[PDB]
Design a protein around this ligand. Structure first.
Ligand SMILES: O=C(O)CNc1ccccc1C(=O)O
Length: 251
């Protein structure tokens, strides 16, 4: 029920935004935006994809996203949730203008307005959380996301949520260990069709963690800090992007 309380706040924030920017207007803004990038194609590229996250401290999310791209990130995740992470849609605009790689909107997405809104602000990918969405809503949200040319990162925490995600038509499934189930990805990944993209969203501290997820079948990992804390996010991302290739074999 606590999640209902959190979602009530999200629904209030969304409703207040819709009062200023109507559904008709946000649809017009979404249609006007440059088309979304082919996120599936990016996720199918060789190597483990690094999805580097912008969060909050950060006076210039665009500059951070640029460092992420320079380091070889596959996708930039932008947290737009205000109440805990001090993110905003403004961050999505800033990041979108700064990088050429796909951009994921990371937020609690619970109603269709937010889908059009994500697109209007340049997102290529959008987070859908199975634990937050009853199946009827999950399916509706996934279909609308795809109808706009975006890809849903469908986040699960249990085998049952994974089954729900598959039934809804998910193409990309992310495993979040936090409700922390430290063996979440391994409990879930093997059960997925080989054709579905697997993302480990939790517990990536360094190259060893990325490699461990890679060895368990991950196609990409999400990393937030301590890319920032490192003081050198480009280098930190570069190290993860090239994980397993160091030390280099003698030449
Ligand atoms: O990124 C993090 O630091 C914590 N993750 C989130 C932050 C805002 C909205 C949803 C999530 C989630 O993973 O379902």
């Amino acid at each position: 029920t606590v999640l209902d309380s959190i979602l009530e706040g999200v629904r209030a924030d969304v409703a207040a935004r819709e009062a200023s920017v109507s559904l008709s207007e946000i649809k017009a803004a979404a249609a006007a935006a440059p088309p979304p990038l082919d996120v599936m194609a990016a996720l199918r590229e060789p190597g483990i994809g690094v999805i580097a996250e912008v969060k909050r401290t950060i006076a210039d999310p665009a500059k951070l996203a640029q460092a992420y791209q320079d380091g070889g990130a596959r996708i930039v995740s932008v947290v737009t949730e205000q109440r805990r992470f001090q993110g905003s849609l403004d961050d999505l605009d800033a990041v979108r203008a700064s990088v050429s790689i796909p951009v994921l909107r990371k937020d609690f997405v619970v109603q269709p307005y937010q889908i059009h809104e994500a697109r209007a602000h340049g997102a290529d990918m959008l987070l859908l959380i199975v634990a937050a969405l009853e199946q009827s809503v999950l399916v509706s949200m996934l279909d609308r996301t795809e109808s706009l040319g975006m890809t849903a990162l469908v986040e699960v925490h249990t085998e049952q949520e994974a089954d729900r995600a598959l039934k809804a038509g998910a193409k990309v499934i992310g495993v979040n260990a936090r409700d922390v189930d430290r063996d979440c990805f391994a409990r879930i990944a093997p059960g997925l069709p080989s054709s579905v993209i697997r993302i480990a969203e939790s517990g990536v501290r360094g190259t060893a963690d990325l490699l461990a997820y890679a060895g368990a079948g991950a196609d990409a990992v999400l990393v937030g800090e301590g890319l920032v804390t490192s003081g050198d996010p480009r280098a930190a991302v570069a190290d993860l992007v090239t994980a397993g290739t160091h030390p280099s074999c003698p030449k």
